[PDB]
């Protein structure tokens, strides 16, 4: 069951951009893909938010998925992020299907106006039109969890990346959906939140940290699976400062912190694309202090 | 051009068929006509009221083309554009070729944004297009310094300020020299227009024009004439409608307009997912609102 295979770490790769002209450096992307899949990560998500999906043209988005399937060459499941207007999401999905992806992850709609009934229809229509394994990234607190309960029966909804950091809500929705729907519950907010989500029912989590230190994410996963609380909290305390730094400025630092940290480690990442520019000298020092703390 | 933008910027809906969600261009033409034939001199296809993000890139381009055709000189056409910088530039160049007068760059929808990056985002698009541009500024987490730094751009002709923070708005208006000539537009419509006007705005956006353009015109004229009693009277009259549209964190923004238009026998069709039809409760609230405006036909 694909759902079971998704109950692990979903690594979200960065999309390296050249500082010179902002173009994608595919050689660097290959190095990123290798670092992730060659180090214990069995699920990779091109066109995810950590990939700066929205900074990519549709052609670039399709090519990233295409290149991912090629570079991965069976070493991991490939989940293609898709989004935008219904017809566009379907176009991206079909391109991903032909490219050889294993499933698609439907980003949450970015429209300024959304309602529960409309969000349900949005996801449902794309999943039914594609007739292909799909995951949904659920992150708007203003939209009722009932949407997930109603989508659960869909054959092709194999998982949900729950991204609302409301533990009571998550615990409740996990228990409001029959086991016969086989939904893989994944913490969509990474390592800082994974321990808490895990206790509440999650069996997997996303990670941007795998772009530089996949070993740390794997350690977290194994500790959680082994029910080794002591180890879990140890690795958590070790990782959370990095996640806190990424979360600065209402998450504005989310990808740029990863890229500047990678570059300080001499890994190739390049820069972020506008609407996000480089870190301030202040944050650069904080990144340095973190890597120093990790003895890297 | 900046001066011409100091007025009402009408944002047309994009009529969608209930049957298959396709765009009904005949209904779109009717909407464009209702807007421009009733005092509105600036129309903004691909605006958020137009459900821009629910349109494919090709549908967005076609809407701009259709607008230029249906308007045929009766008003300035400002094309909404957005997405990745290259994509925004593609949409912008398409609008230019279609005959648009300017473009409105939507606030980027990327989940991760920083002040320096947003500045670069807008700057890169404006410089690449070398065409009159407006920016929709609505994220309170992004410093107004971004606007101060963009102001010098020759092609930045206006800002649709959409952060309902009056002290912030009043200060940024006074932080940019007259030398940069910027049309300051209240991007949050009639409910906020009177307050923004007092603080320095000389224009405002409106979704209300899709059904009752005369009400929007009345507010603009009252504000321009400094007729305070009239401003507040018109304001109190329109607020309930804007509050109903604002329900569910703005989820009701367009659907309320469309169901209200249909009740008034104006062709609007429905909204596209991620927004579906109104609940019975809200349908009743729209009815009671139209009834209070004395717009519903007598029954018996």
From TrEMBL, chain A:
Pyruvate binds at residue 50. One of its GO terms (molecular function) is 4-hydroxy-tetrahydrodipicolinate synthase activity. Keywords: Lyase. SMART domains: DHDPS. The active site is at residues 137, 161. Its EC number is 4.2.1.52. Transmembrane segments: none annotated. InterPro entries: Aldolase_TIM, DapA-like. Belongs to the DapA family. This is Dihydrodipicolinate synthase. It comes from Shouchella clausii (strain KSM-K16).
């Amino acid at each position: 069951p694909l759902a079971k295979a998704l109950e692990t770490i979903s690594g979200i790769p960065i999309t390296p951009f050249r500082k010179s002209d902002g173009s994608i450096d595919w050689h660097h992307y290959k190095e990123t893909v290798d670092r992730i899949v060659d180090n214990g990560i069995d699920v990779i998500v091109p066109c995810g938010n950590t990939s700066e999906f929205y900074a990519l043209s549709l052609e670039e988005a399709k090519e990233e998925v295409r290149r991912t399937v090629e570079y991965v060459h069976g070493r991991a499941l490939v989940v293609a992020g898709i989004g935008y207007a219904t017809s566009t999401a379907i176009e991206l999905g079909n391109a991903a299907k032909a490219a050889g992806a294993d499933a698609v992850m439907i980003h949450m709609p970015i429209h300024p106006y959304v309602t529960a009934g409309g969000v349900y229809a949005y996801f449902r229509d794309i999943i039914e039109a594609l007739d292909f394994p799909s995951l949904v990234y659920f992150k708007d607190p203003e939209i009722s969890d009932r949407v997930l309960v109603d989508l659960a029966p869909l054959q092709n909804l194999v998982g949900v990346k729950y991204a609302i950091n409301d533990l009571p809500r998550f615990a409740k929705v996990v228990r409001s959906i029959p086991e016969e729907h086989q939904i893989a519950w994944i913490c969509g907010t990474a390592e800082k939140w994974a321990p808490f989500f895990w206790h509440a029912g999650a069996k997997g989590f996303t990670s941007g940290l795998v772009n530089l230190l996949p070993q740390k994410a794997v350690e977290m996963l194994e500790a959680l699976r082994n029910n080794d609380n002591d180890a879990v909290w140890r690795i958590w305390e070790d990782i959370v400062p990095f996640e806190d730094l990424r979360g600065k400025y209402n998450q504005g630092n989310n990808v740029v912190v990863i890229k500047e940290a990678m570059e300080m480690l001499r890994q190739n990442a390049g820069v972020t694309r506008a609407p996000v520019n480089e870190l301030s000298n202040e944050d650069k020092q904080l990144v340095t202090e973190l890597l120093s703390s990790w003895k890297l």
